[PDB]
Amino acid sequence: LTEYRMFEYPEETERPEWFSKEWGEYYEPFMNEWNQLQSRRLILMEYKGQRVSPYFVFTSLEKELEDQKGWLDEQDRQLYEDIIVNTVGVILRNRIKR
Amino acid sequence: SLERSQFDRLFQAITSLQNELENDLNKSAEEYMRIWEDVFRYFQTIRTSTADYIAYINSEQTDQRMQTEAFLVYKNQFTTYLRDFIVSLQKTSLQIQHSLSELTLERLQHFFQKLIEHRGAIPRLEDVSSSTNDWLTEYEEYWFSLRQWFLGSAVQQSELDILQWQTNEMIRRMTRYVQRIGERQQHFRSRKKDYLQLSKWFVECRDSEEAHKLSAVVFGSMTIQHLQLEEATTENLHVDTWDEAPTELTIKPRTVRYREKTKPGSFNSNEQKKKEQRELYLKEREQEKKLIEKYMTQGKITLSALSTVEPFIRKVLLSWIGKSMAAKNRMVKTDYGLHVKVMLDYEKTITLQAEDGNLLMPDATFLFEETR
Amino acid sequence: QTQLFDEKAIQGMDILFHHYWILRAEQPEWYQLIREREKVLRRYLDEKFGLRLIVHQHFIKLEKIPVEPEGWMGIQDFQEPMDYAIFCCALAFLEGKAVDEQFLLSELCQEIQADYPGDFPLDWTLYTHRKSLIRAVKVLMEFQLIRTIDGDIGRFDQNEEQEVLYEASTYSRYFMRTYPDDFSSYQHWSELLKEDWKLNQEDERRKRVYRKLFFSPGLHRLDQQDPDFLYIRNYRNRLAEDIEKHSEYKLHVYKNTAFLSIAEPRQYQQVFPNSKASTDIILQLSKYIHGEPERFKANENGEILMTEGEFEQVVDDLRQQFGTGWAKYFRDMSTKGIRTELLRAMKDWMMAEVDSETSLIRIKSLTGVMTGEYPSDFQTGGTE
Hints:
The structure is cut from a larger assembly and holds chains A (about 100 residues), B (about 375 residues) and C (about 375 residues).
Chain A: E1 7-11, H1 28-37, E2 40-47, E3 50-52, H2 54-68, H3 74-97
Antiparallel strand pairs in A: 1-2, 2-3
Chain B: H1 6-22, H2 29-58, H3 60-65, H4 70-102, H5 109-121, H6 132-151, H7 159-186, H8 192-203, H9 208-218, E1 225-228, E2 247-250, H10 271-294, E3 300-302, H11 311-326, E4 331-332, E5 340-344, E6 350-353, E7 358-361, E8 364-368
Helix pairs in contact in B: 1-2, 1-4, 2-5, 2-7, 4-6, 5-6
Chain C: H1 7-18, E1 21-23, H2 28-36, H3 38-49, E2 53-55, E3 59-62, H4 81-94, E4 102-104, H5 105-115, H6 127-142, E5 146-149, E6 165-168, H7 190-196, H8 204-215, E7 219-220, H9 227-234, H10 236-246, E8 250-253, E9 257-262, E10 270-272, H11 277-290, E11 304-306, H12 308-321, H13 328-331, H14 335-348, E12 352-354, E13 361-363, E14 370-373, H15 376-383
Antiparallel strand pairs in C: 1-3, 2-3, 4-6, 5-6, 7-9, 8-9, 11-13, 12-13
Helix pairs in contact in C: 4-5, 4-6, 8-9, 11-14, 12-14
PDB class: dna binding protein
Keywords: SMC complexes, Wadjet, DNA loop extrusion, DNA binding protein
Entry title: Neobacillus vireti Wadjet-II JetABC monomer
C-alpha cells in the first residue's frame, strides 16, 4: 500500500486535573492504570486528496474492484483478439498467394 | 439485433447461382429470376446492415459516451454487433469473395437475357419504357456493385475491406479507452503540495540565471550542448588550450557585400575543367597505346625478342600474364580496344631488361585480335 | 541470443539525451526504437551514468539530473523567475483536473492568481504579467501537457478579455519526477542534489565525470587537484574508447578543460558554433586572445582575468577591426550592450564567468578551442 503513504499517530487524552487531589495508596494503582490505557493508536491514509481511515479506503477499493473486474470479461477479450487476428490471417493468406 | 445467418443466406443464394451457371442456361427463366431476387434481396439486407452498423461505430453518441458509464452500454452493444454480424462476415466473406471472383459479367449475360425474358413475362403496368437493354444495364450495374462490394477494385479498397479495417480501428479504440479508465481510476496520488512548494522556491530567485539553475536541478536538464569539431586533433594532456594550436574556422561575414543566401544558390558550370581533364586523360591513353605499339612486331610481341623495355611496358606485360592465367581461354582484354591472347612457354631463362633491374621470367607471346 | 549496443542503441541514446522525453502518441518511431534496446540502454545508463531511465506506456524519459546546475540547462523559453512560478502554479492547477477534462483560460488565470506564492500579487491588468502567462502556456503546450480546443492565446497579449478552452492531457501526471522524502521538508534546492547523489555512493566519481562530460559543453578544472579532472587524466584512453564505442562523441583533454566534440551533428542537436551572430564575435575574440599571448597570459588554472573596462576595450578593438562584418544587430549597439550580450552568450556555453564579488571576468580555457576569421578576400575588402 506504500502508494497511499500510510502513517499512524497515537491519540491521547490529557490527564484530568483532578488527578492532582491526592487520594492515597489505594487509588494510585487505578490512576497509573488509566495513564497507561488512555493512549490509543490511529491510522490515516491519503486517498485521492483526502486523508481517510482504512475503513474508507477498504470500501473504496471494494467498490472499484467490483466495478473494474466487470469491464473486460475474458470471452470479449478472446473475441477481440480473434477479430483482429482474422484480418491479419487474411493478409497473410493474400501475401502467401501472391 | 442482426441475424447471424445474413451472409449464410447470401452465400446460399450465390451457391445456387453458381450451380445453375454451371448448367449453362439449360433451365427456365423463372428459376433465374427467383435466384437473382433472393441474391439481391439478401445483399440489400446486408448493405442496410453495414450502413447502420458503420453509423453506430462512428456515432458521436459513442464519442460523447466515452466520458461516462454509458460507454459500457456502448461496449455491450458493440460486442453484440461483432458477435452476431462481423463473425459471420469473417466466416463467409472468403467463399463469397472467391465465388464473385469466378462470376464476372461474361459468366452472366446469358443469364441476364433470361432474367429479361422473365421480366417481360411479368405484366408490369409501371412506367416501363426503358428498353430491354436498360434492364440488362440495370442488372449489370447491380452485379458490378456486388462485385465491387466484395472484391473491390484495382483502384479502390473493397467495401468489405473498409468495413473490416474500420472495425479493427474501433476495437483498438475501445480497448484503449478501457485502459484509460483504469489509468484514470488508479494513479490519483496528487502532487499539488510539491508544485506549490516549487513555485515558492522559484519566486525567491533573484534573476533568470538562478531560476534556470533551479529548473535544471528540479525538472532536469531539458537538453545538452557540445562543440562541433571534425577530428580529435589534439592528444596532449599537458598543454593548455591557449598554447595549443587552435581550430580555424571561416566566419561568413553577415553582409550581402560578400555572400548571404536563402533561395536556391548558383553553380559554376565548369566546362573548361572537364575539357582539360578529358583531353589529358585521352592523351595519356593514346601515348600508352603507342608505347605498346612501339614494340609490336608483325602483330604480336615476344618477350625474348625485346632488347630493352620501358618499365611501364614491363608492368603492363606482367599484368597481362597474371590476368591471362585466370581466364581458361587465356584471352585478355585491354582499355585500348585490343583483345589479347597470351600463350606461355615455361622452360626458359629469359631476361626482360629496362632502366631498373633485369627480370627473369618464363617466355610468352602476345597476339592481338582484329577489333574491326 | 543476447542484445548488443549497436547503431540502434546509439541512436536511441542520442534521442533520449537531446529531448526531455519521447511521447508514443507523437514520436512513434523514436519510441519504438528506444524501447527495443531499452534493456541495453538501462544497463549502460545505470552502470556508467546512474540516471534513472523511465520507460512507460505513454512515454520514455531520462531524468537528466545535473552534477552542478548551469544556466543553459533550464527551460529556455522562459526569461524571468515569474515565468517559472506561473509554470509551476499551472502544473499545480492541472493536478486538480481529471484526464481530458476541459477548462477555460479564465479559470487557469484565476487559479494561478490565487495560488501565486509571492508577496506581490499576480495581476492580469498588466502587460508583463499577461506576457509571462502566455510564455508559460506556450511551454506547457510544447510538452503536450495541455491540448488546445480551438481559440487563440497569442491575442491574450493585447486583449485581456480573450478566452480559450483548454484540455488537460494525461502527460500532466508524469511530468515531474518523484522526490525522496516528503518533499516539503526541504528548504533549498541544493538539498535536492545531496539526496539524488545519496543513491549513487557506488562509484560516485565515474558517474560524476560521465554526467559532466555528456551534459555540459565542457568540464573545467576546478583547481590543481580537482578530483574529476584527475580521474579523467588517469583513464583518458579507456574513457575515449568507451565513449567512441557507445556514442558519436570523441573525447578531448587539455591541461585546464575536457569536453566531448561531435563530428556530424544531426538536426535536433544544439552545437557551437551555430547561426547566432554572438558566436561570430566569440570566435573573433578567441582569435584576438590567441594573438597576444603575453598580454593575455592565462593563469595556471587556464582562466584569463579581465575587468569590465578591459573587456570593453577589447570589444571596441574588435568592433574596429571586424565590426564591418558583424551582424547589423551588433554594429548599431554601444560597447556596453555588446559586452552584456557577448557575456550572456559566453555564459550559456560555459566559456566564461562573471565574478560575483569583484565583477571580474574569467574567460575559461574552453574558449581557446576554436578561432574564427573572415575570408581574407573580404578582410582586404574591408580595407577598401
